[PDB]
Structure formats: structure tokens, C-alpha cells
Design a protein around this ligand. Structure first.
Ligand SMILES: CO[C@H]1O[C@H](CO)[C@@H](O)[C@H](O)[C@@H]1O[C@H]1O[C@H](CO)[C@@H](O)[C@H](O)[C@@H]1O[C@H]1O[C@H](CO)[C@@H](O)[C@H](O[C@H]2O[C@H](CO)[C@@H](O)[C@H](O)[C@H]2O)[C@@H]1O
Ligand SMILES: [Mg+2]
Length: 362
């Protein structure tokens, strides 16, 4: 079970049984800004259970994230994958992504289930409305207060010093460095440094130039999230050497994000440019290779169950309707992506042991 391997996990799926309505599965098709173009693509919400907002279909069908049994199935699959850590997509209590409902209520249950399968839960902080340095304090406080004690709560052990919580900050570049430095530097007017609320804050690097904003912000590390090789500077495999080199010089944790593929045309019909066919695992293994070549301190997987963007490694099954031939993992099995992860997790976990200075050779 590899505690250096994180996977982005979403708890925002709903269905009438547990949640009394479909949530996320019944995703609306997102309009292109330009109506001249949008009118030539589909319109409306998908109609689960047979029409979902995904190119792929799950073994668990149009499941509820709040289904105790689904959570369990999810832990089992991540444990089979040799992934120690799910990075849970998070919105403050009583707040939600624009196409979902609140999910903070469900964190306690997800922690209990991670524990049951000997897994760790860290927090992927989404761009909630008017997110800034001040409510980021209130909310880092909230996360560590309410869930910090829990045995499944994730802390990144340094060989020396306290183990520190990790916050992955999605779209960190939205907030100016001088505001971040209020929270993330020692002298910050609202610094969490050397306090009960310290942690490792990982910035999303999109453009090369964000390097310097991230340095100035006082962030501990950078990650790249996007599963499409070439989508951003940061999500392009060729640039991962440079970011590793950069982070090393500046004592930042470089966390590359690897995807098995991308396809979101079920809900962004204009976004074909960023489709990546899986070619039966070869895309995902190129990604995993490029990541391990940087001898990184952690690796992130985009994603476990982002079904809308077709980046999920969660088990998928062939399915056809009167209009739709869903993608699937044929000729391989529903677990191909869980198996390819196990393969590369064990290979990482072995090479990673030869990195430390006190474990170098003649
Ligand atoms: C132009 O915007 C995109 O690209 C920039 C970087 O150049 C990002 O900083 C933006 O956040 C944005 O990336 C998101 O959207 C693109 C599509 O353009 C997608 O390819 C990405 O993977 C990003 O969105 C996903 O991941 C984040 C993090 O977990 C999450 O907030 C997003 O949630 C949105 O998309 C869902 C459908 O895919 C939708 O249901 C939800 O309500 C949205 O907030 C995506 O999971
Ligand atoms: Mg050190």
C-alpha cells in the first residue's frame, strides 16, 4: 500500500434512492459562450440511469457517493491499485460545485471507510466563491479541527519534525501572491506557519510564469492536475523535468499528476482538442513513466472517479443504448486501470526507497 501515491476522488455523485434525485450523473451539456456555435451541439441534462454525463459507464452504474457500499467498493479498488491516499474534492460546509449539492456532511463517513481499508484522506481545495487567504484560514482551521484527530486523516511524515496535513489548492493562481503570503509565509499577517494549523500547501501550476507567483506565495509544493498531455505548460510531460529541477533548487515538493486519458464531450461538446484516447493503457503508462523519471517525492493520479472528463481509473463496463455506444476498457477488463496502477505503484514504491541521501551507495 503506497503512501506516496495520491488519487483525486469526487464524492458529488447522487441518485434518487439515497439522495432523492440524480446529482452530477444528470449533468447539463455546457453551452459554448458563442451561441452561433453552441446551437449546433446537444442541449439539456442527461437522463440517468441509461443516459449519464460521461463517455464511459461505471460497474456501480449511476451510483450515490453517499451509498455506504459504493464508498466501500471504492476503498477496495484503491487498495487493489496500491494507492494509499485519496485527495477528496472539498467545498466548505453548505457550499457546492455549480452542478452538484454540498458534500462536507459526507467527509466523516468517507474517513471511517478509508480507516476500515487502512487508507489516508487528504483534501483538494476547490475554487469556492470569494475564496481568499482569510476564509482559507477559517477553512484550513475547520478541516484540521473537525477531522484532524481521525486515524484516516492524512499527514505527510518527514523523517524529522511533526507530520503535516496536505492541502492541494485547485486554481491557486486566482488569488494574488501577496494575499497567499499573508497565510503561507512566517511573517504573514494571518500565517498558519509554526501554528496548530500548519500544513503542506500545494499550488496548481498552469503556466510556466506561475512558478514565481508560487515561490512568492509561500506554497510548499506544486501539482499539475490535468490528465491531457499538452493542455497546459504544467500538464505537458516534457516540462516535468524542469519543474522537478525548479522545485529542488527552491525546496518545493513537485507532485506530477498522471491521467489514463481525457474525454468530456458528453458535457463540453466543443472540447475535442483535449480528448486523449487510452490506446488500452499505453497513454496512462507513458504518463506514469514520465512522472517516475522525475524521481518525484509524491505522484498524483487524475483521477479515481471524474466520469464527466473520462479520467477515472474506477471499474467501467461496456454499455449501449438506442443513441449511445459508451467507451469501455475492451479488449481488457473493468480493472485494467486498477491493475496498471498496482504495477506502477509497486515500481514507484521500490525506486522511491533509493532516493533518500542516507540510502545512497558507493
Ligand atoms: C479554462 O478553464 C480550465 O482550464 C484552466 C487551466 O488553464 C483551469 O485552471 C480551470 O480550472 C479549468 O479547468 C477545469 O475545467 C477544464 C475544462 O475546461 C477541465 O478540463 C479540467 O480538468 C478542470 O475541471 C476539473 O477539475 C477541477 C478540480 O477537481 C474541478 O473543479 C472541475 O469541476 C468543474 O467541472 C465539472 C465537469 O467536468 C463540473 O461538474 C463542475 O461543476 C465544475 O466546477 C473539474 O472536475
Ligand atoms: Mg527534507
Amino acid at each position: 500500500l503506497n503512501n506516496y501515491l495520491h488519487v483525486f476522488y469526487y464524492s458529488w455523485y447522487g441518485n434518487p434512492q439515497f439522495d432523492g434525485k440524480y446529482i452530477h450523473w444528470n449533468h447539463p451539456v455546457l453551452e459554448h459562450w458563442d451561441p452561433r456555435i453552441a446551437k449546433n451541439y446537444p442541449q439539456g441534462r442527461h437522463n440517468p440511469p441509461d443516459d449519464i454525463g460521461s463517455s464511459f459507464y461505471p460497474e456501480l452504474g449511476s451510483y450515490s457517493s453517499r451509498d455506504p457500499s459504493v464508498i466501500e467498493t471504492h476503498m477496495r479498488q484503491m487498495r487493489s491499485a496500491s494507492i494509499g491516499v485519496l485527495a477528496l474534492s472539498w467545498y466548505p460546509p453548505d457550499v457546492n460545485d455549480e452542478n452538484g449539492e454540498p458534500t462536507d456532511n459526507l467527509v466523516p463517513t468517507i474517513l471511517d471507510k478509508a480507516h476500515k481499508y487502512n487508507l489516508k484522506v487528504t483534501f483538494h481545495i476547490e475554487p469556492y466563491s470569494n475564496r481568499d487567504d482569510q476564509n482559507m484560514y477559517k477553512n484550513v482551521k475547520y478541516i484540521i479541527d473537525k477531522y484532524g484527530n481521525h486515524p484516516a486523516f492524512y499527514r505527510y511524515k518527514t523523517k524529522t519534525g511533526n507530520a503535516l496535513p496536505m492541502f492541494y489548492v485547485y486554481d491557486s493562481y486566482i488569488t494574488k501572491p501577496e494575499k497567499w503570503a499573508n497565510l503561507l509565509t512566517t511573517s504573514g499577517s494571518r500565517s498558519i506557519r509554526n501554528s496548530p494549523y500548519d500544513g503542506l500547501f500545494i499550488a496548481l501550476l498552469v503556466e510556466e510564469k506561475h512558478k514565481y507567483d508560487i515561490l512568492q506565495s509561500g506554497f510548499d509544493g506544486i501539482y499539475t492536475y490535468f490528465a491531457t498531455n499538452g493542455f497546459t505548460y504544467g500538464s505537458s510531460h516534457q516540462n516535468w523535468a524542469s519543474l522537478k529541477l525548479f522545485c529542488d533548487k527552491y525546496n518545493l515538493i513537485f507532485i506530477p499528476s498522471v491521467g489514463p486519458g481525457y474525454i468530456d464531450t458528453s458535457i463540453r461538446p466543443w472540447n475535442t482538442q483535449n480528448t486523449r484516447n487510452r490506446i488500452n493503457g499505453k497513454y496512462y503508462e507513458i504518463g506514469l513513466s514520465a512522472a517516475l523519471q522525475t524521481r518525484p517525492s509524491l505522484i498524483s493520479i487524475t483521477s479515481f472517479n471524474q466520469w464527466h472528463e473520462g479520467t477515472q481509473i474506477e471499474k467501467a463496463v461496456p454499455k449501449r443504448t438506442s443513441n449511445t455506444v459508451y467507451l469501455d476498457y475492451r479488449p481488457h477488463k473493468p480493472g485494467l486501470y486498477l491493475e496498471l496502477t498496482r504495477k506502477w505503484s509497486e515500481k514507484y514504491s521500490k525506486e522511491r526507497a533509493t532516493y533518500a541521501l542516507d540510502r545512497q551507495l558507493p
